[PDB]
Write a protein that binds this DNA or RNA. Structure first.
Ligand SMILES: [Mg+2]
Ligand SMILES: [Zn+2]
Ligand SMILES: [Zn+2]
Ligand SMILES: [Zn+2]
Lengths: 394, 49, 263, 113, 140, 66, 56, 133, 196
RNA sequence: UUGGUGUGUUU
């Protein structure tokens, strides 16, 4: 599907018959590990060997002219682990640090100075992340108008390639252009950018081993008070949509540009329940602690987002078909458990529950229609995408 | 199984249309070309003679 | 310096309290007592005649899981360095078994107690099926009916857990140190409050609580351990412990010799 | 079906040494040792025991891939010490502690019967 | 009995605790709607059980009502590819594909519906030990 | 099918404790309490006997093959 | 189906697995697939010895 | 060796986001409008509001890879209790005497303001710190 | 049983697992990162209900849409002498230095899908070609070859190294040699060679 | 070492 989707490699011979990869190359081929097939053509000449080794090798295809950015970054564990590693309050004893800096293939043989000397030498993990990244880098970023005093400890300034402050996250080391990887590529050629992924992934896997990280059913639970606040807010939202019903079915409603009465009615409904979902998910995001695992993963951006935690814990929102609320499949109702002409959110598919509490059956079924939309989309429009892409090629 | 053939990519016959309460399976349908067609008679199905 | 403190002992388990070693050395003992204990089990199986309701490698698999006595086992050598081409009575315990449901009615349970040692480099009491009591019929190998002739011939050779876990010496190993987290090596996840919800150890009452005014003893180290080395019955727990230490000694000494011989 | 041997965990090959040393010439007085046919069970025990000694400065091991029963270790002590000597003394101290351990355990099982 | 045409002309409550209008604020349970539109309903039908809306390869699933529904569809379209026990006479039958899974355990998250596919008396898998924790990058 | 020998997780031999388990069940015990009496205290040797369901009786329901 | 695109040889195919203990330009090869496929290296004056061993 | 010396008043402590790391803001006694902020570890050296702090900045603790310290040697730090090494990362000659030095202790921070006559020697790269009491 | 699928990535022997306070090791370790976007919270509910029904020793009714909350399962796991939300303090197997976060851990019902790797491994030097077109054959069963299809050629054009493409569509395929008369330009030229 | 139809499953 794009000009990286064939890439050259090198041969490593292993028993136990499967194909091994790095996991930074998972993004360009778009492969997961639920059973994909990947082929392996072999050159039969010297000529084609050099052709592959100088053009189609991975270190020369890092930067995609699709969007002039690197498209090979960091994936799930190495990313969320390194964000847990170089938070400010993370200290490591010397002994474990010996191994951790042994794992770098490009380490010279010199430990840094430990950032505490007394009363018992520790480190902070930002210097260990500084061991990997070579000498000759600069990267200055201002997030949200930070200072040079840094209260929230976000943002990023790097001089010499030693971190000065800042929580190293997706929006620095992910796929974002002008990030760390792009900068290393522009300033050092291909090969050092190849060794960047090796250094970071081996380091943060060894440390994410000896720390560890997990996820439990409590991590989507907030305390009873925040549950009360979310319940109050979404109940007030259902009061708001009752006001919408009251005025519009009492004919007090004003019509938007270009949309008639039912279209602006449904548009109002969509905005209002989206506001419900956004404020409720925001409160549930605000309460949760930072040793909480799920908030660490979303605040690392290796997987997932805000709407994930909102849907697991506070509210799933409105079930859709084709962007709209759900058709009255029958006359005037969209199951036989409802009354006629009730445009209440529990009729046409607003999950009031979390995922956690359980769904009423009707709400479960309306989410089944959501998955039905997703299935039909992903196995129908790919017809048009394949045919369009073939025609642009030819 | 459903004979629309496959001529017509239409997502109206592939919808989980909401007469389906207890008659077919809102979970089960294969991945891909069959999806939206193939309806497994429910655990309260009976066929009238 | 290091001190042993047995707390319980019976024949199916031992719960001791190893005190004052490093943490690595105690967990290295744990890894040994799962892995590197040379014992004896069923290594090549030859059916003479089978007609069962069960298939063949099935029953060879289940026989491979069967607990033998190997108390005397260190004067039996390893299979892959014993001085015979294929099996003799220097390094085998040849079980030949044929129970046979004679009479055309009923249920025939080939148990562990019917298993016959035919030979073995005796009179080392090896290769007997382990018996709870002596009226321990035991391991449920087969259920035979009318004429279902089951004539089997096994060899018993000597492997460790590294080849396969049918040579597991032992079963399940508890392990903990600092039950009151006075090093803050671990960090609790907690909703409300750390003290209330994580219930106390079974070794909480062997020490004191921490006092809230105390500082973090940064120069402290972990220093008192607790482990639980149960038995399959194949060995007795004292022998397990002894030979596990012995084997770990021998591996360390071989590393020493390769140092000194490269030297 | 490409499944190899599972006695690749402890039996050495023929012309491969069990203990393969290469001195690392980046820094003075450091060595790299290619252990054959082991796992962590040797390595961590050697790590913490080499850690607490004074004259030892740097010691670190890695297991390159856990589907291969080998590992490699780095060893830099101070200036004066040939580090091989220090590791041999380390083995001496460990077997000293454990043989004392077996001894008192034998005594304690004698009493507990 | 009703078919899809009488499904037009009915009025259902889901569970028989919802037929009597019930009695709070507990953050464990689930929230049925009030149905306060008709003050005096004439319910004509109530479901025997809601997990009877499923298909046969769908009632196997432990708690289908806590998931993202494409994964429900995936589990139902993978439950057919279990290795297990297909019929109990694999000694005499000669078939081009057959596979017996050795040690089949009835799941500890059984349903009440798996009595009626006999799956607790012919299971197709095991209970092994889940431990959801990134360990050494091998489950990335 | 028929009881395995060890546990799957730990490795305590359990296979003998099938017949005793049924005989304890015959008196009206409860299954957890029966596992309690047999000294099964980790849940590893509790799922290796508690889940297990029995087919080899059905295989001996075939009146003789030969 | 046969000229613009076709089927060819010296291919291979399997199911994959992740392995972070690796570089970025490395891919694991099962042994049997290494046995089946091959590559013609020219016998030159700088590679005789190993290639004779690969015969052996 | 020591290029700074002063004694400080602890006015604010922010544990906040960090369970092991706190932020102090120390306003000098001996010459005011010398503002000092130092992020610090609780459990190596717990501090509290309105204590006394002897604060020293050095560039060499003598009176290349770090080994852990011997007993036979000695340091400037031997009369101290919380010794952190840092790097001078931003030096800004500001206003009239708004002279701000930003030196980072590897994830930890240190802002310093005040007179030119004190800070004038500080223009270095690697600057320690040595909290007494 | 919630789709969180995948392959056996790696095999560890017994001691190298993490292991909780009693000696229990695990056998299957799905990923944290497999969860938070896939939003399958039922999988956690199954693991928890599993551990409780193991310890109290009976099979808990997980038929959906009951009043079985999470609270009853939480209280029962606590009041049978455990942590309320599943976790036990698990260890490194290579040190025993405690895993800083407490690890969630239990039994769950697993199954075995019909694919294996021993049925889809295939590689091919040469061999069976069709009579009709002399391009190598199609299917696994006859040891066929793979379809280096259109869009593979597209990405080869995008890289541009067309010499590789002249390897692929000439040399590992139906390489074939004909003749032409240079005047009428056709291939009618009859080829006898040992008479030349 | 067949063709040629057709079905179900994998990404
Ligand atoms: Mg996929
Ligand atoms: Zn012999
Ligand atoms: Zn068990
Ligand atoms: Zn012509």
């Amino acid at each position: 599907l794009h000009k990286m989707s064939m890439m050259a490699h090198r041969v490593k011979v292993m028993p136990y018959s499967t194909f091994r990869l790095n996991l930074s190359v998972t993004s360009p081929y778009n492969a997961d590990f639920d059973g994909d097939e990947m082929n392996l053509h072999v050159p039969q000449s010297e000529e084609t060997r050099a052709e592959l080794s100088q053009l189609c090798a991975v270190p020369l295809q890092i930067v995609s002219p699709q969007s002039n950015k690197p498209v090979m970054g960091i994936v799930q564990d190495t990313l969320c682990g390194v964000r847990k590693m170089t938070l400010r309050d993370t200290f490591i004893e010397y002994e474990q640090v010996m191994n951790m800096l042994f794992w770098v293939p490009s380490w010279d043989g010199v430990v840094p100075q430990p950032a505490i000397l007394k009363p018992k030498p520790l480190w902070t993990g930002k210097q260990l992340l500084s061991i990997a990244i070579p000498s000759g880098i600069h990267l200055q970023r201002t997030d949200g108008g930070n200072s040079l005093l840094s209260p929230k400890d976000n943002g990023m300034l790097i001089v010499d390639g030693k971190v000065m402050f800042g929580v190293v996250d997706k929006k620095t080391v992910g796929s974002g252009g002008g990030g760390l990887i792009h900068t290393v590529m522009r300033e050092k050629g291909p090969k050092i950018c190849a060794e960047l992924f090796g250094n970071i992934q081996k380091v943060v896997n060894y440390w994410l081993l000896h720390n560890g990280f997990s996820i439990g059913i409590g991590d989507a639970i907030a305390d009873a008070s925040t549950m009360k606040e979310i319940t109050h807010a979404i109940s007030s939202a259902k009061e708001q949509v009752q006001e919408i019903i009251y005025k519009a079915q009492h004919n007090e409603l004003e019509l938007k540009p270009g949309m008639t009465l039912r279209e602006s009615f449904e548009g109002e409904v969509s905005r209002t329940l989206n506001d419900a979902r956004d404020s409720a998910g925001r409160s549930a995001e605000m309460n949760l602690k930072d040793l909480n695992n799920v908030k660490q993963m979303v605040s690392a951006g290796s997987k997932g987002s805000f709407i994930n935690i909102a849907q697991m814990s506070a509210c799933v929102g409105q079930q859709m078909v084709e962007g709209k609320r759900i058709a009255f499949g029958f006359a005037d109702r969209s199951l036989p458990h409802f009354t006629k002409d009730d445009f209440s959110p529990e009729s046409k598919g607003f999950v009031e529950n979390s995922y956690l509490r359980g769904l009423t059956p009707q709400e479960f079924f309306f989410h089944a229609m959501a998955g039905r939309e997703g299935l039909i989309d992903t196995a129908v429009k790919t017809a048009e995408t394949g045919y369009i892409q073939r025609r642009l090629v030819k | 199984n459903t004979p629309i053939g496959r001529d017509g990519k239409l997502a109206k016959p592939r919808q989980l249309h909401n007469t389906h309460w207890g008659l077919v399976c809102p979970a089960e349908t294969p991945e891909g070309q069959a999806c939206g067609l193939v309806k497994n008679l429910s655990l309260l199905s009976g066929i009238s003679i | 310096e290091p001190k042993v403190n047995i707390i319980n002992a019976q024949d199916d388990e031992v719960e001791l309290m190893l005190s004052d070693v490093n943490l690595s050395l105690a967990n290295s003992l744990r890894r040994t007592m799962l892995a590197e204990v040379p014992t004896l089990a069923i290594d090549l199986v030859e059916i003479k005649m089978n007609t069962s309701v069960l298939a063949d490698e099935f029953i060879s698999h289940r026989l491979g899981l069967i607990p033998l006595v190997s108390e005397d086992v260190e004067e039996m050598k390893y299979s892959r360095d014993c001085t015979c081409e294929d099996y003799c009575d220097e390094c085998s315990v040849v079980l030949e078994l044929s129970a046979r449901h004679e009479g055309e009615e009923g249920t025939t349970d080939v148990y562990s107690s019917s298993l016959i040692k035919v030979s073995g480099p005796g009179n080392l009491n090896v290769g007997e099926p382990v018996r709870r009591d002596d009226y321990d019929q035991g391991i449920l190998l087969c259920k035979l009916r009318n004429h279902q002739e089951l004539n089997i011939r096994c060899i018993a050779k000597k492997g460790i857990a590294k080849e396969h876990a049918k040579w597991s010496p032992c079963s399940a190993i508890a392990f903990e140190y600092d039950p009151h987290n006075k090093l803050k090596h671990t960090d609790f996840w907690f909703e409300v409050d750390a003290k209330k919800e994580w219930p106390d150890s079974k070794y909480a009452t062997w020490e004191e609580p921490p006092k809230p005014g105390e500082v973090f003893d940064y120069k402290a180290k972990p220093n008192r351990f607790y482990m639980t080395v149960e038995t399959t019955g194949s060995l007795k727990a004292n022998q397990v412990f002894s030979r596990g230490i012995k084997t770990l000694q021998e591996k360390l000494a071989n590393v020493l010799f390769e140092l000194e011989n490269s030297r | 079906m490409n499944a190899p041997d599972r006695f690749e965990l402890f039996i050495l090959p023929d012309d491969v040494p069990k203990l393969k040393i290469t001195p690392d010439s980046r820094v003075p007085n450091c060595i790299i040792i290619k252990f054959e046919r082991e796992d962590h069970t040797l390595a961590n025990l050697l790590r913490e025991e080499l850690a607490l000694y004074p004259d030892v400065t740097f010691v670190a091991y890695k297991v390159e891939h856990p589907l291969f029963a080998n590992f490699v270790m780095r060893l830099q002590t101070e200036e004066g010490t040939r580090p091989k000597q220090a590791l041999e003394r380390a083995c001496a101290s460990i077997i000293n502690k454990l043989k004392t351990l077996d001894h008192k355990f034998n005594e304690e099982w004698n009493i507990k019967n | 009995y009703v078919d899809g045409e009488e499904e037009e002309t009915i009025m259902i409550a889901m569970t028989p605790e919802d037929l009597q209008t019930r009695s709070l604020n507990d953050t464990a349970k689930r929230i049925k709607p009030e149905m306060s539109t008709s003050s005096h309903h004439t319910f004509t039908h109530c479901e025997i059980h809601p997990s009877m809306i499923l298909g046969v390869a769908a009632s196997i699933i432990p708690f289908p009502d806590h998931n993202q529904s494409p994964r429900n569809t995936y589990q139902s379209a993978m439950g057919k590819q279990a290795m297990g026990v297909f019929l109990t006479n694999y000694n005499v039958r000669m078939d081009t594909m057959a596979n017996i899974l050795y040690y089949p355990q009835k799941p500890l998250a059984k349903t009440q519906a798996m009595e009626y596919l006999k799956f607790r008396e012919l299971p197709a898998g095991q209970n092994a030990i889940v431990a959801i924790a990134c360990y050494s990058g091998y489950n990335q | 099918m028929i009881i395995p020998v060890r546990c799957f997780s730990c490795g305590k031999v359990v296979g003998d404790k099938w017949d005793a388990y049924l005989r304890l069940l015959e008196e009206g015990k409860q299954e957890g309490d029966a596992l309690d009496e047999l000294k099964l205290k980790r849940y590893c040797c509790r799922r290796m006997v508690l889940t297990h369901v029995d087919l080899i009786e059905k295989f001996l329901r075939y009146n003789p093959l030969e | 189906g046969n000229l613009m695109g076709k089927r060819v040889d010296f291919s291979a195919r399997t199911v994959i697995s992740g392995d972070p203990n690796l570089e970025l330009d490395q891919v694991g090869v099962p042994i049997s697939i290494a046995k089946t496929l091959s590559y013609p290296e020219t016998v030159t004056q700088y590679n005789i010895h190993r290639l004779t061993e690969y015969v052996r | 060796s020591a290029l700074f010396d002063d004694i400080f008043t602890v006015q604010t402590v922010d544990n906040g986001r960090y369970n092991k790391v706190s932020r102090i803001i120390g306003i000098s006694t001996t010459n005011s409008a010398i503002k000092l902020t130092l992020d610090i570890n609780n459990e190596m050296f717990p501090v509290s509001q309105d204590d006394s702090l002897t604060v020293t900045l050095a560039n060499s603790l003598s009176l290349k890879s770090w080994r852990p310290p011997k007993p036979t040697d000695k340091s400037l730090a031997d009369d101290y209790d919380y010794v952190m090494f840092g790097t001078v990362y931003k030096f800004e000659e500001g206003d009239e005497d708004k002279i701000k030095v930003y030196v980072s202790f590897g994830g930890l921070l240190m802002c310093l303001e005040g007179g030119y006559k004190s800070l004038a020697s500080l223009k270095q790269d690697n600057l320690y710190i040595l909290i007494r009491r | 049983r919630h789709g969180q699928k995948g392959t056996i990535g790696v095999t560890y022997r017994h001691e190298d697992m993490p292991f909780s306070a009693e000696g229990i090791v695990p056998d299957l370790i799905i990923n944290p990162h497999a969860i938070p976007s896939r939003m399958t919270v039922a999988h956690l509910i199954e693991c928890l209900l599993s551990k409780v029904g193991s310890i109290r020793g009976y099979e808990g009714d997980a038929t959906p849409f009951t009043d079985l909350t999470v609270d009853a399962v939480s209280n029962l796991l606590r009041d049978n002498g455990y942590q309320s939300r599943g976790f036990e303090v698990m260890y490194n197997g290579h040190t025993g230095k405690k895993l800083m976060a407490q690890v969630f851990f239990g039994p769950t019902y697993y199954q075995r899908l019909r694919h294996m790797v021993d049925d889809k491994i295939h590689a091919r030097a040469r061999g069976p070609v069709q009579v009709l077109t002399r391009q190598p054959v199609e299917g696994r069963s006859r040891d066929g070859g793979l379809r280096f299809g259109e869009m593979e050629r597209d990405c080869m054009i995008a890289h541009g190294a067309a010499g590789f493409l002249k390897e692929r569509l000439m040399e590992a395929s139906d390489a074939f040699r004909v003749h032409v008369c240079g005047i009428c330009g056709l291939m009618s030229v009859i080829a006898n060679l040992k008479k030349n």
